[PDB]
Amino acid sequence: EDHKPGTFPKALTN
Amino acid sequence: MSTAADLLRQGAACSVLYLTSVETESLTGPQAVARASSAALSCSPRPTPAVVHFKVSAQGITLTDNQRKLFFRRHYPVNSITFSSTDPQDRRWTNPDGTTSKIFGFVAKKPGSPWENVCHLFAELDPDQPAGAIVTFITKVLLGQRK
User: Fold this and answer.
1) How far from B129 is each of A2, B50, B124, B137, CA to CA, in Å?
2) What start and end residues bound the annotated signal peptide (chain A)?
3) What's B30's domain CATH number?
4) Do A9 and B11 touch (CB under 8 A)?
5) How far apart are CA B120 and CA B67, in angstroms?
6) Chain A residues touching residue B7 (CB < 8 angstroms)
7) Which one of A2, A3, A6, B94 is least enclosed by Cβ atoms within 10 Å?
8) Which of A1, A7, A12 best tests the B interface by mutation, with the highest count of B CBs <10 A?
């Protein structure tokens, strides 16, 4: 909605 | 979209508008979303849409059954995802309320059937994560399409 989440993976990038 | 790592390094679990799923195994990237969207309008397999959970990760995309009212569970990892788009030709969905929202679709291969891929159609929601951006960086960070 307003706040961007970020809790699930292991901080990946390709 | 190169600094899009912010979304994948975090793994945002947002909320999206669930619409319907359509087979796009023989279709290409954007065309997948096209048949998926057009069929959803012309045939209308699903009547009333619902807001469900969606998780964006560089290891794969995941759908989530927040209410488990229609049918949700998960999605597909990077090993199954082949393409992601926000719309075929910039089409929108008309909610029963009258409001219109973008319709994005993800192309991924289903477990057991690596020869085929299905495009699950979902309308935009959650103004914190723009649909026209989420799939854009996803395609670039998931497949490595990044410039």
Assistant:
1) 8, 18, 9, 11
2) none
3) 2.30.29.30
4) yes
5) 18
6) 4, 6
7) A2
8) A12
